Design an enzyme around this catalytic site. Structure first.
Site, PDB file in Angstrom:
ATOM      1  N   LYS A   1       3.526  14.609  40.838  1.00  0.00           N
ATOM      2  CA  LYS A   1       4.963  14.272  40.857  1.00  0.00           C
ATOM      3  C   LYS A   1       5.812  15.502  40.587  1.00  0.00           C
ATOM      4  O   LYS A   1       6.946  15.544  41.051  1.00  0.00           O
ATOM      5  CB  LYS A   1       5.213  13.140  39.885  1.00  0.00           C
ATOM      6  CG  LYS A   1       4.344  11.898  40.181  1.00  0.00           C
ATOM      7  CD  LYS A   1       4.826  11.201  41.474  1.00  0.00           C
ATOM      8  CE  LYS A   1       4.134   9.820  41.663  1.00  0.00           C
ATOM      9  NZ  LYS A   1       2.688   9.916  41.415  1.00  0.00           N
TER      10      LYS A   1
ATOM     11  N   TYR B   1      -3.264  -2.585  42.212  1.00  0.00           N
ATOM     12  CA  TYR B   1      -2.730  -1.435  41.478  1.00  0.00           C
ATOM     13  C   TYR B   1      -3.085  -1.472  39.995  1.00  0.00           C
ATOM     14  O   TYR B   1      -3.014  -2.517  39.342  1.00  0.00           O
ATOM     15  CB  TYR B   1      -1.210  -1.386  41.621  1.00  0.00           C
ATOM     16  CG  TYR B   1      -0.568  -0.209  40.908  1.00  0.00           C
ATOM     17  CD1 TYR B   1      -0.457   1.022  41.525  1.00  0.00           C
ATOM     18  CD2 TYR B   1      -0.045  -0.354  39.627  1.00  0.00           C
ATOM     19  CE1 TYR B   1       0.157   2.106  40.869  1.00  0.00           C
ATOM     20  CE2 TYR B   1       0.554   0.691  38.979  1.00  0.00           C
ATOM     21  CZ  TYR B   1       0.659   1.915  39.598  1.00  0.00           C
ATOM     22  OH  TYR B   1       1.266   2.924  38.909  1.00  0.00           O
TER      23      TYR B   1
ATOM     24  N   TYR C   1      -5.280   6.221  39.706  1.00  0.00           N
ATOM     25  CA  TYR C   1      -4.962   6.953  40.922  1.00  0.00           C
ATOM     26  C   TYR C   1      -6.075   7.906  41.323  1.00  0.00           C
ATOM     27  O   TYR C   1      -6.826   7.639  42.264  1.00  0.00           O
ATOM     28  CB  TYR C   1      -3.674   7.770  40.739  1.00  0.00           C
ATOM     29  CG  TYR C   1      -2.363   7.004  40.597  1.00  0.00           C
ATOM     30  CD1 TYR C   1      -1.650   6.562  41.722  1.00  0.00           C
ATOM     31  CD2 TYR C   1      -1.792   6.814  39.356  1.00  0.00           C
ATOM     32  CE1 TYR C   1      -0.431   5.877  41.594  1.00  0.00           C
ATOM     33  CE2 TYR C   1      -0.586   6.134  39.210  1.00  0.00           C
ATOM     34  CZ  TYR C   1       0.088   5.669  40.327  1.00  0.00           C
ATOM     35  OH  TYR C   1       1.288   5.018  40.138  1.00  0.00           O
TER      36      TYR C   1
END
Lengths: 342, 333
Positions: B48, B263, B289
């Site tokens: 990110k 998720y 992830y």
């Protein structure tokens, strides 16, 4: 004029060194923190960003300690630390890269802060990285002696162990911060930065002992201040000097290190090792909220609290430049969740 | 030609590209290299950070005085956005989505949440799963404009065309490294979610005619939905740069066989991937992830999907701060 950059490096060249971290680490200014305090310009050396299992200063020592382990042909690593030790986590990770298991003795120095201190933080990481936690000993145990008894037991079973002392602070391990001193000198020269003071959190003594040795060996003029995380001023200075002199002899540098080079301030220890003060917690919040940088409540947080207080008492001029060595420790924050939630 | 776009210095670039000799020998297939985008140096780092270097530069040119963003409870993007904005002396207003409600108090209060609080994030609300988070953000932003604010809304995961420029730059960075290192890159694999990382990498690898296959291992969406979304974002990022021609659709590949139950719910292979990387290479993945990304890479190597002489680059996208949010699951084994 008499500065001798590379002299340290030339003595380090004859020693084995493994590549375990990402070096050089950046040297960058903290502009919001510098304006908030209204004094000298504060730079940070990012030794939290070494890349080894969330990083930290212990990574520099391990590059020399495990090179020396491989040279002896060791087939298992032993070390020890407090429950939330950063050294233990980085040693296990580093040893796994080299394909070696790590037997660990943890010491229950701190028993406050609930289950998160017992089982989160560096403890969770130790487990994920496959560390063999052999025992949890009571506070005050001779941890070095317990590792030597374990080492002798494993030797009788056929192992070839390498014992790493607490914090990695042997003279071999201190070579990592001799190398950092040279890296800091070259970095600041290339950035055209004049360093007026270096400040960092000092504990098992290897980081300060290595920096002092590198700085004296290159005839640098840069005063260095250790902020103690546990021991009183006179005790910490005597242990740093003793290790730094042993590291000076290992490098084969003639003569003696100047005693005036070892300076410690213990006003930021608080109630003891692993117990933050309200100034520790303010330093964490200030660094996170002004700079997005994560300190830790045991080590780098006390080192920064020391620096913030010294600036506030007027010890530095606005035109001075200070380097704070971020020694890492972010993983320990999670062991301290109960205290943050109050 | 990305210097036409504003960019702030938030991370430590370039990141290392290292071989993993223990994992590669253990699996017995191709040679696995790891691109260490977990080491960007921004509040324990992550992918990110690359997006925010462009998002927060664009936000500064627009004169923004407050950042708004959103993510799931243990969002890595929320943590890095608060930290990056703090460097600019900006506050961040955060909406959290309660996607996952298992794993107890650590999931709710540790991990990225503990960091979010320490970094000073203003968590406006905890919204139920399924909420239209982008609409919730736009309502908050319009409410802040009436108070005289100039807000900059960052979409989920920082995955706008401007954010994806972060991984267009990573593509150029990877090419230069493998060139200097004299390494032939045969495949790139990484965990794909809000689509920005994959859209940026595809747009960069394609604009330079690199001919390196890219595979995104989905962490949530099924294959067709994820490929549709990556392709659309990569197209807009293609147009944002002025690249000639058009982006080929066959460059977008996703494998969604490792999503498991949804998720933030790791499978047994996810957890095996975390143990293998930690014990063989001292490298910390995350169970949301990058661990699912590596479970897919490990499983495809076991299926002989690759030859031994190939070189695979796994992009470690980060996420280790979320490990602490999952303590209760780890303490079942």
């Amino acid at each position: 004029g008499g500065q001798q950059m590379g002299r340290g490096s030339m003595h380090l060249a004859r020693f084995p060194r493994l590549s375990l971290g990402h070096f050089p680490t950046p040297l960058e200014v903290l502009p919001n923190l510098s304006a908030y305090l209204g004094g000298p310009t504060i730079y940070i050396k990012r030794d939290d960003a070494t890349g080894l299992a969330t990083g930290g200063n212990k990574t520099r020592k391990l590059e020399f300690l495990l090179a020396d382990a491989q040279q002896q042909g060791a087939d298992v690593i032993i070390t020890q630390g407090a429950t939330q030790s950063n050294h233990v986590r980085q040693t296990i990770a580093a040893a796994a890269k080299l394909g070696l298991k790590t037997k660990v003795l943890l010491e229950k120095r701190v028993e406050d802060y609930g289950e998160d201190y017992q089982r989160s933080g560096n403890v969770l990481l130790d487990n994920l990285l496959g560390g063999d936690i052999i025992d949890h000993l009571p506070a005050g145990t001779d941890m070095q002696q317990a590792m030597e008894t374990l080492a002798e037991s494993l030797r009788k079973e056929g192992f070839k162990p390498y014992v790493i002392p607490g914090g990695g602070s042997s003279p071999v391990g201190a070579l990592g911060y001799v190398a950092c001193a040279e890296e800091l000198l070259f970095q600041s020269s290339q950035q055209r930065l004049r360093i007026d003071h270096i400040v960092h959190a000092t504990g098992s003594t290897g980081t300060q002992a290595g920096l002092v040795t590198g700085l004296a060996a290159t005839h640098s003029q840069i005063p260095l201040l250790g902020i103690s995380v546990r021991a009183p001023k006179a005790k910490q200075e005597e242990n740093v000097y003793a290790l730094a002199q042993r590291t000076w002899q290992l490098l084969g540098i003639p003569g003696e290190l100047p005693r005036s080079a070892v300076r410690v301030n213990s006003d930021y220890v608080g109630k003891g090792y692993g117990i933050p003060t309200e100034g520790t917690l303010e330093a964490l919040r200030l660094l996170a909220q002004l700079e997005g940088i994560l300190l830790d409540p045991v080590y780098s947080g006390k080192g920064m609290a020391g620096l913030i207080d010294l600036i506030r008492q007027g010890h530095f001029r606005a035109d001075e430049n200070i380097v704070f060595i971020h020694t890492g420790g972010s993983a320990g924050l999670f062991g301290y969740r109960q205290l943050f939630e109050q």
